[PDB]
C-alpha cells in the first residue's frame with residue numbers, strides 16, 4: 001500500500017548526477033501493483049493499457065509477469081514488437097483504426113479488436129479476415145461506445161462479414177471512485193450475454209476496462225483491495241462461464257514514478273512569491289490540461305509556509321502550475337519532488353520552446369536503491 | 382496577401398504518395414511574410430521567435446534572408462547551431478534561464494539576453510560576464526515582465542554586476558488586433574529611455590516583441606500593411622536614435638502551412654454525424670488547448686452541409702475538435718484540409734497513444750509546386 005517516494009536525501013544524490021528535470025520510475029512498484037491486482041481480482045486477465053506509460057523497461061517487466069497489452073496504434077504495437085511481445089498478447093482496443101494500425105495488426109498477427117460502429121466492420125474484415133472482435137457499449141458514470149440496443153446488431157453484422165463475435169467491452173471512465181458503475185455495467189453486459197445465447201450467438205469474453213483510481217494531490221478516498229474484491233465477487237456471481245479481462249492504465253504505473261525538478265527562478269514581487277520550475281505544462285505537467293489532474297508537490301523547506309505560485313520554464317503565459325500553494329521559502333537550485341507522476345504525464349510531454357523531454361531513470365539500476373536494499377537487509381530478518 | 386492553400390487536386394495527388402496525417406509548408410510564403418515585414422516595418426530588425434515553428438528548412442531560409450533568431454532554450458540554440466547560425470545572430474529571450482541554457486549561450490557565444498527579475502542577474506553575470514541585457518517590462522492589452530518602476534533599478538543592478546545594460550523589451554501579447562498597445566508600450570519605453578539618459582545610463586536597443594496577428598477560422602479583421610506602417614511611423618516619431626527589433630513568431634509561418642488529414646471513422650448515430658480524423662488534439666490540434674485557437678477546416682463536399690462533430694484518433698474523450706460544424710457528408714478515406722496551421726501546432730504535438738508526429742513536407746520540393754510553376758510561367762508574362 002505504499003506509494004513510491006524518494007526521500008529528500010535520495011533527491012540530493014540523484015540530482016548531483018542527473019540534471020533536472022528527470023523522472024524516476026520504480027519497477028518494484030510496477031510489479032507490486034500488478035501482483036496486487038492479480039491477488040484481489042484473480043478472475044480478471046490484464047491488458048496493460050500502455051497509453052498511460054509506455055516505458056520499455058516497464059513493458060518488458062509486465063510482459064515477463066504474463067500481462068497482456070492493450071494497444072491503440074501502430075506505434076504501440078511496434079514498440080511491443082521490438083521487446084519480443086507477440087501479436088497474440090495484444091488487443092487493438094482503439095474502437096476506430098487507421099490504415100497503418102490495421103497493417104501492423106495484420107503484420108504482427110494481432111487477432112483481437114474492439115469496435116463501436118458499423119463503419120468499422122469492413123475495415124477490420126478486409127484487414128484481418130478471421131478475427132475476434134468485442135463490441136464496445138456505452139455505460140454510465142459520448143465519443144466512444146455503441147448504444148446498448150445496437151450492440152447485438154453490431155455483433156451479428158460483424159459475423160455476416162466473417163469476423164468472430166467474441167464478446168462485449170466497456171469503460172466506466174478514468175479515475176473511478178465507486179464500484180457501482182463497474183457492477184451496473186457488469187449487469188448491462190449480463191443481459192446482452194443472455195439475449196445473445198438465445199439468439200444463436202455464444203459470447204466467450206468480457207472486457208471491463210480500466211478506471212481504477214490513483215492518489216492525487218488530495219490523496220485517495222477509496223480502499224482498492226475491497227473495491228477489487230467486490231468487483232471480483234460480482235464477476236463470480238454474474239460470470240461463472242466467462243473469460244473476463246481488465247485494462248488498467250493509470251493504476252499500473254501512476255504511483256510508481258516521481259518527478260524531480262529544480263527551482264530556476266524566483267519572483268518575490270509580493271504579495272505572493274512565484275517559483276519558476278524547470279518542468280512545465282508543456283512537459284510532464286501537461287496532465288493539468290488533458291487529464292484535469294492535480295499532482296502532489298513536495299518542497300523540502302524548514303521555514304513556515306506561505307501561499308505561493310508555481311510556473312514552468314516556458315515563455316507562454318499559460319505555463320502556470322499551482323496557485324495559492326502553501327510553500328516554504330525556496331531559492332534557485334532547490335529541488336522539489338512530485339509524486340504519483342507515472343500516468344498521462346510524460347506521454348503528453350512536448351519539446352515546446354526546444355526543451356528536451358524529461359528522461360525516465362530506472363530506480364532499481366541506481367545506488368540509492370542499493371542503499372535502500374542494504375538498509376532493508378539489516379533491519380528486517 | 383494570399384494564404385498558402387492547397388487546391389483539392391493537390392490534396393489528392395499528395396495523399397496518393399504520403400500517408401495522412403501530414404503537414405505541408407511553403408518556403409515561398411515564409412519568404413513572402415518575411416519580406417512583407419521588412420517592407421512595411423523597415424525600422425525593425427527581425428528576431429524570428431522560433432518557438433512558433435522550428436522546421437529546419439524554415440530556419441535555414443530565414444537565416445539566409447538575414448533574419449536573427451530569438452531562442453528560448455538550449456535545444457533551440459542547438460538546432461540553430463547545426464544549421465551554421467552563430468550565437469551573434471541570437472537573443473536568449475526567455476526571461477528565466479536554466480543551467481543547460483546558460484551553458485549553451487556560453488558555448489555558442491550568445492551575447493544578448495532578456496530578463497525581468499533581480500534573481501536572474503547573477504545567473505547571467507557568472508555565465509556570460511560581459512553581456513548585453515534588455516529588461517523586459519510588463520505592458521497592457523502576469524508571469525513575465527518587471528513592473529515599469531523596477532525597470533531602471535534592474536538595469537543599474539545589472540551594470541553593478543558587470544553586464545552591459547543595452548535596453549528595454551516588451552510583448553503586447555499574442556494575436557494582437559489593434560496597434561494601440563504597440564504605441565502605448567512604445568511611449569512607456571520612451572519615458573524610461575529619457576529617465577535613463579539623464580541617469581547617466583545610455584540605452585541603445587528597443588525590442589517591441591511579437592503579437593502580429595494571423596487569420597483564424599473566422600479570418601482576419603486587421604490590415605497588416607497599415608498596422609505595420611503605423612507602428613513603423615510611431616517608431617520613427619519616437620525613436621530616431623534607437624536600434625529597434627521585433628520578435629514575430631506566429632506571423633512568420635502561420636499562413637504558410639496546411640494540415641492534410643483523412644477521415645478514418647464515421648458515427649452516423651444522429652442527430653449529428655461524428656467524423657473521426659487521423660490528426661487530433663494530442664497532435665497538431667493541440668493549439669485548441671494551449672493557444673485557445675480555432676483553425677479553418679475545409680471538407681471538399683458536393684452535398685448540402687449539416688451540423689457535424691469532428692474528433693481525433695485517440696482513446697481519450699477530450700479528443701474532440703469541432704462541434705456543430707457545417708459539413709457535407711464525408712466517408713472514410715476522404716481528405717479534409719486545415720489551413721493557417723504553421724504556428725503553435727506541431728510544436729505542441731505528442732506521441733500520445735503511440736501515434737507518430739505528423740511530418741512537415743516542403744511544398745517546393747514537390748511536383749505539385751512544379752505544376753504550379755508551369756501553370757504560372759504560361760499564363761503570366
Ligand SMILES: Cc1ncc(COP(=O)(O)O)c(C=O)c1O
Pocket residue numbers: 049051052070093094171173174175209210211212247248249250251696697
Ligand atoms: C480501452 C481503454 N482501456 C483502458 C484505458 C485506461 O484507463 P485508465 O487509465 O483510466 O485506467 C483507456 C484510456 O483511456 C482505454 O481507451
Ligand SMILES: Cc1ncc(COP(=O)(O)O)c(C=O)c1O
Pocket residue numbers: 315316430432433451474475552554555556590591592593628629630631632
Ligand atoms: C519573447 C517572445 N517574443 C515573441 C513571441 C512570439 O509571439 P507571437 O507568436 O504571438 O508573435 C514569444 C512567445 O510567446 C516570446 O516569448
Ligand SMILES: [Mg+2]
Pocket residue numbers: 350351352727728729730731
Ligand atoms: Mg514536440
Ligand SMILES: [Mg+2]
Pocket residue numbers: 346347348349350731732733
Ligand atoms: Mg510524447
Ligand code: NA
Pocket residue numbers: 082083084
Ligand atoms: Na527481445
Ligand code: NA
Pocket residue numbers: 003005296339
Ligand atoms: Na506521497
Ligand code: NA
Pocket residue numbers: 463464465
Ligand atoms: Na551548415
Ligand code: NA
Pocket residue numbers: 384386677720
Ligand atoms: Na483559407
